Design a protein around this ligand. Sequence first.
Ligand SMILES: [Cl-]
Lengths: 182, 178
Amino acid sequence: DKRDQILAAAEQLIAESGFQGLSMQKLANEAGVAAGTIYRYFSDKEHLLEEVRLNVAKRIASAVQAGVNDDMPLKERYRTMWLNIWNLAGSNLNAISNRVLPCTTRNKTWELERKMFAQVDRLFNQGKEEGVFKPLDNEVLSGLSFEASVALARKHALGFYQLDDDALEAAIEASWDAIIKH
Amino acid sequence: DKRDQILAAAEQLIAESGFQGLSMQKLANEAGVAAGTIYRYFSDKEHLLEEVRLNVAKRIASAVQAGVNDDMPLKERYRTMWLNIWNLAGSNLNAISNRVTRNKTWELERKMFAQVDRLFNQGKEEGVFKPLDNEVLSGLSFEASVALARKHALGFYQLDDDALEAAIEASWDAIIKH
Ligand SMILES: [Cl-]
């Protein structure tokens, strides 16, 4: 089964030179398969692209959630994921997803991707249940904390500022302030 | 206006295809000119691109700081900017900026956002804000406006008014001392 190999080649090419650039021929060349092999797995370029988006979302979700267990205290689960996000900066996953349609597909993709972040939801739900977090939708809590520090990571990896360990922990703490009740 | 036409065409191609779809041939064709005319008005693609970046940055800076008066209270300026950012989402201009360097370019760009720096410097000097770097303070607050606004413009998630007000307060919590 060459599906992952093809997705890996595809993702590399998209990271490199984007969605619209993708050639089925170079894909086959880079994946090391005949063109015909690609069509045994994907009906056409457009279906391949959707599978790429879903596959990138799945990898991000497992990277973000790596090392988390729901036994940890809330703040430690938060810190772990926050730091996993920081360490994704400069990766292919970030590169690809910073681009990502109609809205039959657009909403399909969005909905399928949300299901993949089950431990992020459990953190925010548990926090709200415990009276620790502000009572906002998990999408808002995510936007105020995790999703925003993608921005810090991005701007750090691109050189806009250097952050020492004291400074990083200060950033983690400040973002926690955004989501906790005061 | 011919120069400006080329610049607008450049920005449009970039909005559609990024810097990787910006070839001089494609631009000539998008602007309805010969490629020579491009070389005449900019010297080369690098210089065309620096002008695109500066143009786009100035327009973003203008939008971000619209209606901000330096004498108003700290939190009022904050709110105005947070909402200005929110309303950039889904725009033409945000598209082109998303897709877009020298030290001189960055120095010139930063000067355009001087009000944003004065907000953070004044709040730190007054003991209101956490003593962090302005880029970090901005990362902790206004980038929440960007993330939320994006998801919102895409039609992914809808924030009613009370929720938007709460989100503005929450992101203020990130940057103030407690
Ligand atoms: Cl096969």
